[PDB]
Symmetry: D2
Subunit: 225 residues, 4 copies
């Protein structure tokens, strides 16, 4: 595609103009992320989302837009009675989703594809508190420059990054980075996980800028809770 970023002429408000592939960024009515609030959410009988992850990390990469751990694709979650395989997880500071108009300092996205290429993203909010042992396995080898990949020595257990309480918000949205494709199932856990001040600072300094897309209009959607 074409070069995109978070500020200036290539920032989020301009993404739809940068490449024909990115049209959804501007024409889409079901875009992500969103604000999750009292007026837009509705109590619903949402199925438990069961997690069956494995330790098949390949590497960690700094791609200039995030820090991402690329997985082998063997582990999966179950959504809508189907297996969605974990391909990668990556991070944003501050959070992309907001709750009652407020950001969390950090948000992790676990990106899954089913047999037919349909996408489900699990979102986990982080608050500052105790050091996160699982996050540290990745952080201790975080690539400091864009384009760098590092082989991970410790075994990665992505399940340990999820909250203990697995209650979630669900809505139909989009990828939050170009091409901002729609038909994406979002599963955003209600309970935040903790990370240390130091862990958050390390990520923010390595990135050097906020890498969150602004929240998008809910339009016709309800968020299920």
């Amino acid at each position: 595609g074409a070069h995109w970023g978070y500020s200036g002429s290539i920032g989020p408000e301009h993404w739809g103009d940068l490449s024909p592939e990115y049209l959804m960024c501007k024409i889409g009515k079901n875009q992500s992320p969103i604000d999750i609030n009292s007026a837009d959410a509705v109590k619903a009988c949402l199925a438990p989302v069961s997690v069956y992850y494995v330790s098949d990390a390949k590497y960690v990469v700094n791609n200039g837009h995030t820090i991402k751990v690329v997985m082998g694709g063997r582990g999966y979650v179950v959504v809508d009675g189907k297996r969605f395989y974990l391909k990668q997880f990556h991070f944003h500071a501050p959070s992309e989703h907001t709750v009652n108009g407020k950001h969390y300092p950090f948000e992790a996205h676990f990106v899954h594809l089913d047999k037919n290429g349909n996408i489900t993203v699990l979102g986990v909010f982080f608050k500052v508190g105790k050091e996160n042992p699982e996050l540290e396995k990745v952080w201790r080898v975080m690539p400091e420059e864009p384009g760098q990949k590092r082989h991970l020595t410790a075994r990665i257990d992505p399940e340990k990054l999820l909250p203990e309480n697995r209650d979630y918000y669900r809505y139909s949205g989009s990828l939050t980075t170009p091409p901002c494709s729609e038909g994406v199932r979002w599963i955003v856990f209600k309970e935040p996980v903790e990370m240390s001040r130091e862990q958050l600072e390390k990520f923010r300094k390595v990135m050097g800028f906020d890498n969150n897309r602004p929240v998008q209009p809910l339009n016709a959607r309800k968020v299920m809770k």
Copy 2:
């Protein structure tokens, strides 16, 4: 825009190719109508949709695609705490939405726009049974040829066309005719209304072809029930 229809080179499967304005018909992942079934629906605490219609019909038109009653825009429903004003209502045979993979013989759409142009459509299924007195007010002056408009003499009470039980399915979808714009709130009443064999036959003969868009993939969406 450009000429579209329900068969041949201008049929629904081709709409997205007929005009630049119609791109959503083919790129959209949140399209209407849909099948409403057990696997795609979820029990939700949906707000009552209150109806405050008035008798401000202007005329009935056969536009070659449907029979439509154009309203003045004074009456409204309340959805998401906002007034959506009734602009027009019109009809499809067989139904556009299906339930458990099955059509109803007929479906009415009541099209509403809020202050900012956002669209809400209320859908009402009809089954064959007793003659519908309210429908007859329109049917007795139904324009038989495309492009014809008739002034309505009887006072139209669109509320009398809704089911007595106002429980509904809700989802985020699209217009079912070009340009198939998304961000449309759908409110599809669960209980069907009755019309006579004769009323259904009259509509179908005047139209001369089935004017339903095929059901579209649910993709990331849940239907709320």
Copy 3:
């Protein structure tokens, strides 16, 4: 206990004074049956009630109060993660429970006890329609005298008496006959099943009288739907 019936000083309105063990039947605040209506019901995320019945019927008995099929106690239903074993099932005409104040012609009750003696009743409504083959297995050998037991010449499959759709109403209730004991789990299925008019007529004649207790005050309860 004591003695009881459906008319006069032994009818439902009097049961409560006929014994100190027939107490709850006046001091009780959680009695059955009830009217199930819009005002008293709340949409709730009710777990599916799974049914695992076996053909262990022992005998069919006319005990003067109903026509009853006594089971071996091996089949069971799962409610609140616990197994409740089918001890017996029996019949009422007209229905004991009402929906929106209206009776069904006929109601079947399936009575279950867990390991610790706790009771669950499943209720099934019947409407007049096509002859019920499973019911006919019992009808063709229906006993006619208070105290008379008869042997079943056919294999009884009680699950075949249940509706195909297993959605249900639930509340904390009572036995509908003295000692009108409380703490009964009630699972009343929404979809009625069909029996012949001839089938209904036979039960009503053999019974000779209406064997349904009038509906009881809901009090502090909600019905879950």
Copy 4:
């Protein structure tokens, strides 16, 4: 009635035998308080409980069992479309209700009666934190002897003791003190409010003992959340 307390032959475990009017306190199947946990709670479309209190406090009383503020009965809450009038409110340390088996340091009860004598209690949990100004209005004039009543020198606004978020748990329950009467509507608010450690300490010292009844068997009930 009779006589009761929180230790020995007058403690909660014995109340049930101390009078024939203290009966339900052993034969009852619907008692309070209860543990509110994942297994016993079901997501449900609960109506908002609207609160319309007025400042009609008459006196604060130490009746040996609690510290109680008696109200004129003019303020009310709306439950099931009916008005339930605030007669009195009072306090427990530690909390009577538990959430997932864990006590809060403190619980407030607000006791309401409708026109026909039916009871609703609203429950509010307190955690240790910043000093509670509304609570302090009552504390600064707290009476210290069983039977002692004192006059309030400040205007009492009981609604200021409620959490800002009014989401709640609901069940069909009992009084938590003899005659432990059933058919009580329980509305227990989810969000706790803050009091000072000094505030908690005073109540605990003035009381001298734990005045919370142990949690009771859920039986056939579900808690709605």
